[PDB]
Amino acid sequence: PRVPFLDLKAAYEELRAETDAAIARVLDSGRYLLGPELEGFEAEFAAYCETDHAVGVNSGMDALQLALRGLGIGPGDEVIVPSHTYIASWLAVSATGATPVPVEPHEDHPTLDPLLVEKAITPRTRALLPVHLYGHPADMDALRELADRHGLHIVEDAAQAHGARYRGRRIGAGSSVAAFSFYPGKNLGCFGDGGAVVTGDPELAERLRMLRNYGSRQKYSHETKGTNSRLDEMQAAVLRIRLAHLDSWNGRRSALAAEYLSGLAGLPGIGLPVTAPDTDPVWHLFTVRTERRDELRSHLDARGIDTLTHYPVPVHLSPAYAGEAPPEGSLPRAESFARQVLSLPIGPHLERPQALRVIDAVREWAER
Amino acid sequence: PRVPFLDLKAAYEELRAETDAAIARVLDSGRYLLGPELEGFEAEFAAYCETDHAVGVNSGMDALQLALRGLGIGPGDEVIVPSHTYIASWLAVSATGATPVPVEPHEDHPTLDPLLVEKAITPRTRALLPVHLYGHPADMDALRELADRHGLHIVEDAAQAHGARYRGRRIGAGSSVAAFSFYPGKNLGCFGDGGAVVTGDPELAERLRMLRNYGSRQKYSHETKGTNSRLDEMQAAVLRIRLAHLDSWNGRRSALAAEYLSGLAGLPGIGLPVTAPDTDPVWHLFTVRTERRDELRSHLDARGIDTLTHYPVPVHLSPAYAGEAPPEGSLPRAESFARQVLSLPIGPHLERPQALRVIDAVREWAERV
Ligand SMILES: [Cl-]
Ligand SMILES: [Cl-]
Ligand SMILES: [Cl-]
Ligand SMILES: [Cl-]
Ligand code: NA
Structure with missing residues (x-):
């Protein structure tokens, strides 16, 4: 499962x-x-x-x-x-x-x-x-x-x-x-x-x-x-x-997010999402950043965990914007994001223990 | 009803x-x-x-x-x-x-x-x-x-x-x-x-x-x-x-169309839709033309018949385009169709009797008028 x-x-x-x-x-x-x-x-x-x-x-x-x-x-x-x-x-x-x-995005958000x-x-x-x-x-x-x-x-x-x-x-x-x-x-x-x-x-x-x-x-x-x-x-x-x-489902997401933020704390190579001051996020996506993104993804896959990437290609580098956007290197923040980001399972139908399972796997990897 | x-x-x-x-x-x-x-x-x-x-x-x-x-x-x-x-x-x-x-379209097509x-x-x-x-x-x-x-x-x-x-x-x-x-x-x-x-x-x-x-x-x-x-x-x-x-349902529209063509035959003021040669129309809409369509529609309404007009304003005259299309009077066909069209009830769920009823009302109006 x-x-x-x-x-x-x-x-x-x-x-x-x-x-x-x-x-x-x-x-x-x-x-x-x-x-x-x-x-x-x-x-x-x-x-x-x-x-x-x-x-x-x-x-x-x-x-x-x-x-x-x-x-x-x-x-x-x-x-x-x-x-x-x-x-x-x-x-x-x-x-x-x-x-x-x-x-470019904020250095922390x-x-x-x-x-x-x-x-x-x-x-x-x-x-x-x-x-x-x-x-x-x-x-x-x-x-x-x-x-x-x-x-x-x-x-x-x-x-x-x-x-x-x-x-x-x-x-x-x-x-x-x-x-x-x-x-x-x-x-x-x-x-x-x-x-x-x-x-x-x-x-x-x-x-x-x-x-x-x-x-x-x-x-x-x-x-x-x-x-x-x-x-x-x-x-x-x-x-x-x-x-x-909606409010209730989002609540579920927040609960899950709290788990991840807590369980994923202090892991080597695992950059966590920062909640901006005076905001109530809805966690449509729970994202983490790591320099060994592809590796972590595979490990998770190996551990039976489904993930998605939002997004592997920064807009400015998509062929769709060929000849019209800034040159690679000119938008380093977006670029680094694209190469380090990974989305962990989250949703109103994901249960606590499932999330804990995900934490086990990310942890294992980070501690690998 | x-x-x-x-x-x-x-x-x-x-x-x-x-x-x-x-x-x-x-x-x-x-x-x-x-x-x-x-x-x-x-x-x-x-x-x-x-x-x-x-x-x-x-x-x-x-x-x-x-x-x-x-x-x-x-x-x-x-x-x-x-x-x-x-x-x-x-x-x-x-x-x-x-x-x-x-x-422009054809005169009567x-x-x-x-x-x-x-x-x-x-x-x-x-x-x-x-x-x-x-x-x-x-x-x-x-x-x-x-x-x-x-x-x-x-x-x-x-x-x-x-x-x-x-x-x-x-x-x-x-x-x-x-x-x-x-x-x-x-x-x-x-x-x-x-x-x-x-x-x-x-x-x-x-x-x-x-x-x-x-x-x-x-x-x-x-x-x-x-x-x-x-x-x-x-x-x-x-x-x-x-x-x-589809074929079945379109077949029903064709039969009704034939019914309309037949019963509305001989009404000089009412222009009937023409089937071009070598074509098999699907009659999405059954349209007749007449100066005085607004009156006819009134008449039909009174007689408990719902009708529509496709379309009352020719595209060149809608405000959306007017600023960039040809002036009024320069597209007489589109203009004439816009002013004369009237769509009679038609569809796979319309029955012969209902259509007969439509024909009667149309005939009566034409006869009165
Ligand atoms: Cl889907
Ligand atoms: Cl994408
Ligand atoms: Cl509808
Ligand atoms: Cl219209
Ligand atoms: Na849609």
Whole structure:
């Protein structure tokens, strides 16, 4: 019996009946798109995030893209993005025609270094795109201070941070503009692709409802250009159930995280995640860093432990960004991260003893 | 009990059991994206379409857009579109960075007029985007010829034409490049958004699989830029079932169509839809034309009949484009269709009697009026 990285089936199994019923409900409704499930989810998700509006879309990527779009970002604009993140973050900027400008993470936290952000700002800069990587919130007060002083917008990539808190407030609260993914493996996931943009701005909320719907807010009418990026009634129905358990599931993750942080303490060659001050991380991913990453991975594999790497290739070095990003060596932080990082099993369906088993193996290796 | 325009619920009911099971299987599989269902559906669909490959995506708009992108179409490029079509057709083009260039349909056929294309070809023209509107195929032979002569690609908008035939061939057959929508209300629909691109080109197929998946064909690798545009396992499973009944269901629409054509014969003010020669329409929509359609619709409503208009505003006149399209009065065909069309209830769940009822009301209005 192996230790799985993240059991999707178990999420279904835990709420089988409720899940089956919601789906059955949608089926019987004869309403599959832009229905009451979506409205209910949005309402519920908005309140959860301590904000006014939730606009369900098709995926975390569109969420980011439509948010930037709705904020008027496009060609000739620069959007500061993190050098250390998942490629989609950059892709969403690219998709709008705007230019992504990478900024290195903090020396101790996998998020955007505020000090380094300021330096990257230019007259073409229009927005900051911090990513609350692995469920860890970036230094929002600092970034906001900067944004205000430079007249920039802030679109948050909260795809790995559902429910997290920064200085006691939910990610996406108030005047925030935050994008989320409901991809099956996310903290809050469904059985297909899904996403959302949360915002406290009524005009932005309106544009998003339009942009995700062929630029229309009335049948047969198309006021602006737009696309097809919606969250199905089926998925939304399921989301409503998961949402009700979100805090509890994240709680489970935190508990597991405490174990790892405690059991992995003081190990040679094992760099542990640092929780930023006044933050409540959601541990979408539990990451460790070591110079002998490949070795540790194999050892874990040998010990029957499933792992993933987030991410083996720094965005700037992916062929997808060939000829457009800084040269290797020019983003050493992202580079070192990519080569040292490993994700340990974590989830709301992973049990204490399983986590302890993982600790045994990492320990053995570190002590090897 | 009114006559519904298109009962989605009935589609579920008719296959309730199998449908239920398909979904249950997926839930239980623990695999929700890029799985067996998608692979199976793709296989089945490509075959159905008489082609080699099917690339399932999120929507018909994405399908169109990804096809164009895959063909290298973009900024600085022009794509000839029909002046009479659903806005998404132009939107797909815009989304790539290219420019949609409208060309009129035939006078009495809701498809791109091959004779007016050439005149719109420019040095930036990279493709033709014919639309098999309402389930009626556009004149493919003439279009390919023209396209071949100009070194242009052809991306067909087949969102309303699943299973139709052109000169005996399925829409999307062989070397075609055709995009479909699986939106709930389409001829082949699911319980959410869904789409697909079919092609006999192995390279384009590979590009599309990548474009729809963040430019990746392997974990951790992103060879090229890409996006997120996938057809869910749940939706794909349902679609395999529906696909199996497609021909059957389309057959029902054809019979109703024949019923309408027959009963609405001899109504001078009511323009009836024309079936081009050598085509096998799938009648996604049964459209009649008449000046005074708003009145007719009123009449039908009163008579308890639901109807729709596809479409009331021609694309060039929507605010989304107006700033960049030809002026009002310069696209008389698109304009005339927009002002005269009316869609009568049609679908695999509409019965002969209900349709008779529709005919009676139409006849009465025409007779009064
Ligand atoms: Cl619907
Ligand atoms: Cl419309
Ligand atoms: Cl999955
Ligand atoms: Cl990756
Ligand atoms: Na979807």
